[PDB]
């Protein structure tokens, strides 16, 4: 119903995951930022929806499942029912959005956040319309097995700043990263 957004942490080499997990050691403030961005609703009495592929859901520690204070939807064409803890199961990205306009959720949901698989990002990315990409740039190489798709700079513009998002280089466990926001409308 509100805004459609993607959120991702990528290494210098475009890597997002290795063996079902993150390619770098745990970065707690990066995690806190993920949580803060997906969780904050811009409107009273509304909640954000988080859309993720099946392998992303299973990579969140069980004790954090479902992500608290968010509506959790899992995408899969193989599952019959949402996995244990999940609220909704959709067979495609169109259906997950079509569901949003269902009287059920229609008045409950503010923003919609895509929190991954590459598969999921690739598709959201080509979706027609207004979209924002929140990209945490991890500034080093990390051996990965799953990568984020290439951002087309002829369609996405890097914003010079964004309210509530730090513009300076962060550092944790001696890993430098920075937060970026890109916008499209076509
Ligand atoms: N650094 C970061 O920001 C992020 C890192 N990660 C990490 O990346 C990896 C997760 O990877 P990835 O393989 O890309 O997995 P996804 O989470 O995208 O899982 C893909 C599975 O999900 C379902 N699916 C995906 N896209 C769709 C669609 N459009 N319609 C329907 N079903 C879909 C299918 O399930 P089925 O086979 O059941 O049909 C497919 O097998 C892990 O290593 C994880 O830890 C994940 C997200 C963000
Ligand atoms: C593999 N993923 C995707 C993921 C991790 O880091 C990211 N960072 C960004 N910037 N985007 C993403 N999509 C992710 C996730 C794994 C676990 C949790 C998780 O445990 N989340 C808790 C917060 C835990 C904390 O305190 O860090 C939550 O409430 O979101 C989230 C995402």
Residue 22 designated active-site: yes
Alpha-carbon distance of 140 to 12, in angstroms, equals 5
Q: Is the Cβ–Cβ distance between 26 and 32 less than 8 Å?
A: no
Query: What values do phi and psi take at 28, rounded to 5?
Result: -65, -30
* SS3 of the chain: helix, strand, coil, percent, to 5: 25, 30, 45
Q: How is the chain split into domains, by residue range?
A: 1-186
At 172, list the tokens. Answer: 């944790």
Query: What values do phi and psi take at 90, rounded to 5?
Result: -130, 150
Q: Atom 28, ligand 1: which residue's CA is nearest?
A: 92
SS3 category, 173: coil
Alpha-carbon distance of 62 to 70, in angstroms, equals 16
Alpha-carbon distance of 135 to 158, in angstroms, equals 10
The strand ranges marked E within 3-63 are 4-10, 15-17, 47-53
> What residues pair up with 172 in beta bridges, in sequence order?
175
Determine if the peptide bond prior to 116 is cis (ω within 30°).
no
Q: Is the Cβ–Cβ distance between 56 and 115 less than 8 Å?
A: yes
Q: Which ligand is nearest to the CA of 6?
A: 2
Nearest alpha-carbon partner for 132 in 108, 109, 159, 98: 159
At the top level of CATH, which class does the domain 1-186 belong to? alpha beta
Under 8 Å CB-to-CB from 111, ≥6 apart: which residues? 2, 3, 4, 5, 41, 42, 48, 49
How far is the centre of ligand 2, averaged over its atoms, from the C-alpha of 80 (Å)? 25
Alpha-carbon distance of 152 to 18, in angstroms, equals 24
Q: Does 117 contact ligand 2 (Cβ within 6 A)?
A: no
CA diameter of the chain: 48
At 40, list the tokens. Answer: 């904050």
The rounded radius of gyration (Å) of the Cα atoms in the chain is 16
Alpha-carbon distance of 37 to 145, in angstroms, equals 26
Task: Tell me, in Å, the resolution of the deposited structure.
Answer: 2.1
Q: How many CA atoms lie within 13 A of 38 on its CB side?
A: 23
How far is the centre of ligand 2, averaged over its atoms, from the C-alpha of 7 (Å)? 10
Taking the CA of residue 17 as reference, the ligand 1 atom at the shortest distance is 43
Alpha-carbon distance of 186 to 175, in angstroms, equals 35
Alpha-carbon distance of 8 to 127, in angstroms, equals 17
Under 8 Å CB-to-CB from 95, ≥6 apart: which residues? none
Q: Which ligand is nearest to the CA of 34?
A: 2
Q: How many other β-carbons are positioned within 10 Å of the β-carbon of residue 114?
A: 27
Query: What values do phi and psi take at 40, rounded to 5?
Result: -65, 120
Q: Is the Cβ–Cβ distance between 51 and 112 less than 8 Å?
A: yes
Residue 158 designated active-site: no
């Amino acid at each position: 119903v509100g805004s459609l957004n993607c959120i991702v942490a990528v290494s210098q080499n475009m890597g997002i995951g290795k063996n079902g997990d993150l390619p770098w050691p745990p970065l707690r403030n990066e995690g806190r930022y993920f949580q803060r961005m997906t969780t904050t609703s811009s409107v009273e009495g509304k909640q954000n929806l988080v859309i993720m592929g099946k392998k992303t859901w299973f990579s969140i520690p069980e004790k954090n499942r479902p992500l608290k204070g968010r509506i959790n939807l899992v995408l899969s064409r193989e599952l019959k029912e949402p996995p244990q803890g999940a609220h909704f199961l959709s067979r495609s990205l169109d259906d997950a959005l079509k569901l949003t306009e269902q009287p059920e959720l229609a008045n409950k949901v503010d923003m919609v956040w895509i929190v991954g698989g590459s598969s999921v990002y690739k598709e959201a990315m080509n979706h027609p319309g207004h979209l924002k990409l929140f990209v945490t740039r991890i500034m080093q190489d990390f051996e990965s097995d799953t990568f984020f798709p290439e951002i087309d700079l002829e369609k996405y513009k890097l914003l010079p700043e964004y309210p509530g998002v730090l513009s300076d280089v962060q550092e944790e466990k001696g890993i430098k990263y920075k937060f970026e926001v890109y916008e499209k409308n076509d």
